[PDB]
């Protein structure tokens, strides 16, 4: 019949005396004196349905079968619950359905886990369709739909064009390994899943599309970490006849509509800091600006200290307020914490209430060091100053990571705060030995590789110095950071055949090694390529921030575990011999 005519969660006291038929799942069942009470849940909410005197004896034969998560279709009459049965916590607090008919649409076996007691990672993914029935995962998936519509609304206001790009095509370098697809009608040759639609969106700018956008699917065989899985989603954008200012301006407008979905007006324009300044003050190119605790350089301070472990190219410091009152277990635990990061340890010097500098670092001072150490790093009586020495990037990152953990233990991060920042003027190159050490795939066999991608253009001031001082080259790129998370990054592109070949030659791509890999793109630059640039947002992390979830898998409908394991579909699985033949 009519499986559903009303919504369960929308009923009210003014809808009483109405013959309705509902459809949904049984949230709970409780028998009280022979009367069966059920909580009927659909996508709109929960309403209570009761069974009274046997209007039909066949109904009670089925009503006694009802259990948790039974999918049913109930027809009754909305009435007012008797005095003493009102639920001020539920929306439908004073209403119940006196059922007359009842149909079991889908019997439910005893659940692997109840919807109120959450389970582990493997169990929630193996039964994700049951996990998605919970309140928080459902609202997270439905929010991601409004996030897409919010981004499409901004770009549609600016005459952008939604264009789908091939996913079975050529390799695109982004710093990771490619996912391969065997060509059936071409034995030995392999397609490649796109690490990004970077190449196709630059060709679309040569095509005169001017303004392009796409919510694309990107595939990167990375080490399972951070804000994306092997298969993740981006908000891809690209414009022509624009500079970095134009792309930042439209990116801030997209973020404004996104965070407006949760009721937070972003202060436009978002502040910007340079790459060299960002790592100088915070130790990372993606800093958290919800708290202070900035790094204090002490290299000049220890130019006369006889401590050999501080006779290094860099000396950093982070002051923990009130950190001298920590027990020995908390201080010794910081050494085991710093040991897992990749350093010899996090040396510190406590400050007594009387101002005396104490700790293992205090005995190494040079009197004049003990005089100014508390005043140089901005330490108060009772503070704790964690020091980091050694190479610049190693000590900056070790202190930049130690800076964040101090905010966690001291309860310094306000969870309701939002700290956006642009990180501009990054380096365009970095040593290939430092990238492959972090598990990244190098562009070429040379001593350099791209910091974003090889198609990033240098600033016009450093265009003449791609070959000379390679490391000093500043990039025309920009990354947007939110609460210590990188949620997006872009750059102005190279649109000349000769400059793209110079950048390729620096990274170790031979003059023929580019024609074989990117000969189509270099060819397109000979046919009136416009100045263009763009940006791509990590859509999984952006949605997880808007939803308040720290794990990005909470905003993916059917995510995988760490390592590509799929508990739901048991993928990947081997193939037959007949299937393997076409390879």
Ligand X SMILES: N[C@@H](CCC(=O)O)C(=O)O
Tell me whether residue 91 or residue 104 sits nearer to ligand X (CB atom). 91
Asked if residue 196 binds ligand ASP (CB under 6 A), the reply is yes
Q: Which two tokens stand for residue 137?
A: 């995962």
Cβ atoms of 480 and 422 closer than 8 Å? yes
Choose among ligand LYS, ligand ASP, ligand X, none what residue 5 binds, the Cβ cut-off being 5 to 8 Å by kind: ligand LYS
Interface with ligand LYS, residue 210, by CB under 6 A: yes
Q: What is d(CA 357, CA 459) in angstroms, rounded to the nearest whole number?
A: 47
Q: Which two tokens stand for residue 118?
A: 């959450």
User: Does residue 246 bind ligand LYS (CB under 6 A)?
Assistant: no
Contacts of 567 (CB under 8 A, 6+ apart): 122, 123, 125, 126, 561
CB burial of 93-117 (b: ≥16 within 10 Å; e: otherwise) equals ebbbbebbebeeeeebeeeeeebee
**The entry of ligand X, ligand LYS, ligand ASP, none that residue 45 binds, CB within 5 to 8 Å by partner kind:** ligand X
| Helix residue spans in 119-215 (DSSP H) | 121-126, 128-131, 135-157, 198-206
Tell me how crowded residue 134 is: count the other CB atoms within 10 A of its CB: 14
CA distance 495 to 475: 15
E runs forming strands in 229-336: 231-240, 272-274, 315-320
Q: Least distance from C-beta 42 to ligand X, angstroms?
A: 8
Q: Please, what is the minimum distance in Å from the beta carbon of residue 390 to ligand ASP?
A: 30
Q: Does 277 sit near ligand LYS (CB under 6 A)?
A: no
Assign 161 to helix, strand or coil.
Answer: strand
Residue of 452, 446, 427, 437 lying closest to 175 (CA atoms): 452
Binding partner of 536, given ligand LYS, ligand X, ligand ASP, none, CB within 5-8 angstroms per partner class: ligand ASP
| Number of residues in contact with ligand ASP under rule CB under 6 A | 11
* Closer residue to ligand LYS (CB): 5 or 268: 5
If contact means CB under 5 to 8 A according to the sort of partner, which of ligand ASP, ligand X, ligand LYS, none does residue 135 touch? ligand X
Residue 413 CB, nearest approach to ligand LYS (Å): 41
- Nearest-angstrom CA–CA distance, 348 and 243: 45
The partner in contact with residue 229, picked from ligand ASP, ligand X, ligand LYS, none with C-beta cut-offs of 5 to 8 angstroms by kind, is: none
Burial tier of 272 (Cβ tally within 10 Å: 0-12, 13-18, 19+): middle
Please measure the distance between the N-terminal and C-terminal CA atoms of the chain and give it in whole angstroms: 51
Q: Which of 16, 37, 44, 167 binds ligand X (CB under 6 A)?
A: 44
Q: Nearest-CB residue to ligand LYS?
A: 159
In the complex, the smallest distance separating the C-beta of residue 42 from ligand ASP, rounded to whole angstroms, is 39
Residue 135 within binding range of ligand X, rule CB under 6 A: yes
The residue with tokens 């958290």 is 288
- 124: helix, coil or strand? helix
Contacting ligand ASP (CB under 6 A), which of 421, 534, 541, 542? 534
Q: What angle do CA 134, 14, 59 make, to 5 degrees?
A: 60
Q: Which positions from 416 through 455 interact with ligand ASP, judged by CB under 6 A?
A: 452-453
Known binding residue 541? Answer is: yes
Q: Which member of 69, 94, 131, 174 binds ligand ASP (CB under 6 A)?
A: 174
H helices present in 27-98, as ranges? 57-63
Identify whether 348 is preceded by a cis peptide bond (ω within 30 of 0): no
Site for ligand X contains 116 (CB under 6 A)? no
Q: How many residues bind ligand X (CB under 6 A)?
A: 4
Rama region for 502: left / alpha / beta (φ>0; ψ in -120 to 50; rest)? alpha
* Residue 171 in contact with ligand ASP, rule: CB under 6 A: no
> Which of 210/515 has CB closer to ligand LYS?
210
Q: Is 403 annotated as contributing to ligand binding? A: no
Q: How far is the CB of 160 from ligand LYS (least distance, A)?
A: 7
Of residues 471, 470, 531, 529, the one with CA closest to residue 502: 470
Provide the H-helix boundaries in 381-431. Answer: 392-409
Per CB under 6 A, contacts with ligand X among 45-104 are 45
Taking CB within 5 to 8 Å according to partner kind, which of ligand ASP, ligand X, ligand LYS, none is near residue 211? ligand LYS
Q: How far is the CB of 455 from ligand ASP (least distance, A)?
A: 8
448 is in an annotated binding site: no
Give yes or no for a cis peptide into 269 (omega within 30° of 0). Answer: yes
**Interacting residues with ligand ASP between 487 and 516 (CB under 6 A):** 489-491
**Of 255, 212, 215, residue with least CA distance to 235:** 215
Two structure tokens written together for 225: 């970490």
* Binding residue (CB under 6 A) for ligand LYS from 41, 128, 201, 211: 211
Q: Which of ligand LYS, ligand X, ligand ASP, none does 400 bind, CB closer than 5 to 8 A by kind?
A: none
Q: Name residues contacting ligand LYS, limited to 142-181 (CB under 6 A).
A: 159
Residue 452: helix, strand or coil by DSSP?
A: coil
Q: What's phi and psi for 251, nearest 5 deg? A: -70, -40
Give min distance, CB of 543 to ligand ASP, in A: 17
Measured from the CB atom, the residue of 43 and 352 that comes closer to ligand LYS is: 43
Alpha carbons 403 and 295: distance in angstroms, whole number = 8
Task: Mark the binding-site residues for ATP, compressed into ranges.
Answer: 220-222, 229, 486, 538-541
Task: Mark the binding-site residues for L-aspartate, compressed into ranges.
Answer: 174, 220, 452, 493
Could you list the residues that contact ligand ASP (CB under 6 A)?
A: 174, 196, 198, 452-453, 489-491, 534-536
Could you list the residues that contact ligand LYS (CB under 6 A)?
A: 4-5, 7, 159, 210-211
Could you list the residues that contact ligand X (CB under 6 A)?
A: 9, 44-45, 135
Task: Mark the binding-site residues, compressed into ranges.
Answer: 174, 220-222, 229, 452, 486, 493, 538-541
């Amino acid at each position: 019949f009519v499986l559903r005519s009303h919504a369960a969660g929308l009923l009210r006291e003014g809808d009483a005396g109405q013959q309705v038929t509902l459809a949904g799942w049984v949230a709970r069942r409780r028998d009280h004196g022979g009367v069966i009470f059920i909580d009927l849940r659909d996508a709109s909410g929960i309403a209570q349905v009761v069974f009274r005197d046997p209007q039909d004896t066949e109904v009670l034969a089925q009503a006694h079968r009802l259990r948790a998560e039974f999918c049913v279709s109930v027809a009754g009459v909305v009435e007012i619950r008797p005095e003493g049965n009102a639920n001020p916590e539920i929306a439908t607090g004073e209403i119940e359905v006196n059922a007359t008919s009842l149909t079991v649409l889908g019997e439910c076996a005893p659940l692997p886990f109840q919807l109120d007691e959450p389970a582990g990672e493997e169990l929630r993914l193996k039964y994700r369709y049951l996990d998605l029935r919970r309140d928080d995962p459902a609202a997270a998936i439905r929010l991601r739909s409004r996030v897409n519509a919010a981004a499409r609304a901004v770009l549609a206001r600016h005459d952008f064009v939604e264009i789908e790009t091939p996913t079975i095509t050529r390799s695109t370098p982004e710093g990771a390994r490619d996912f391969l697809v065997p060509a059936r009608l071409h034995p030995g040759s392999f397609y490649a899943l796109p690490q990004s639609p970077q190449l196709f969106k630059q060709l679309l700018m040569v095509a005169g599309m001017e303004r392009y956008y796409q919510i694309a699917r990107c595939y990167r065989d990375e080490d399972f970490r951070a804000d994306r899985q092997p298969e993740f989603t981006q908000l891809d954008m690209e414009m022509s006849f624009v500079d970095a200012e134009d792309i930042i301006a439209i990116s801030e407008e997209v973020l404004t509509e996104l965070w407006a979905l949760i009721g937070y007006r972003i202060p436009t324009p978002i502040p910007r800091i340079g790459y060299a300044e960002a790592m100088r003050r915070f130790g990372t190119d993606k800093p958290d600006l919800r708290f202070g605790l900035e790094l204090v350089e002490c290299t000049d301070f220890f130019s006369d200290t006889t401590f050999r472990v501080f006779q290094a190219p860099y000396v950093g410091a982070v002051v923990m307020p009130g950190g001298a009152s920590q027990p020995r277990r908390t201080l010794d635990g910081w050494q085991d914490w710093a040991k897992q990061r990749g350093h010899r340890g996090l040396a510190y010097v406590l400050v007594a209430e009387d101002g005396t500098l104490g700790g293992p670092v205090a005995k190494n001072l040079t009197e004049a060091e003990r005089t100014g150490l508390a005043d140089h790093v901005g330490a108060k009586p009772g503070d704790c100053i964690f020091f980091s020495a050694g190479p610049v990037k190693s000590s900056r990152a070790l202190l930049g990571a130690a800076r964040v953990e101090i905010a966690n233990r001291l309860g310094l991060i306000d969870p309701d705060a939002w700290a956006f920042v642009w990180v501009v003027d990054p380096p365009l190159f970095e040593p290939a030995d430092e990238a492959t050490a972090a598990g990244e795939v190098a562009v070429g066999s040379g001593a350099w590789t791209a910091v974003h991608h090889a198609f990033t253009a240098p600033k016009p001031e450093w265009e003449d110095r791609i070959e000379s001082d390679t490391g000093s080259v500043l990039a025309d790129a920009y990354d947007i950071v939110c609460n210590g998370h990188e949620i997006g990054g872009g750059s102005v592109r190279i649109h000349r055949r000769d400059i793209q070949e110079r950048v390729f030659a620096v990274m170790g791509l031979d003059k023929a090694e580019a024609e074989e890999k990117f000969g189509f793109l270099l060819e397109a630059f000979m046919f009136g390529a416009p100045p263009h640039g763009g940006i791509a947002f990590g859509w999984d992390r952006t949605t997880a921030l808007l939803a308040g979830m720290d794990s990005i898998r909470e905003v993916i409908a059917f995510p995988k575990t760490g390592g590509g394991v799929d508990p739901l579909t048991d993928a990947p699985a081997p193939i037959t011999a007949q299937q393997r033949k076409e390879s």
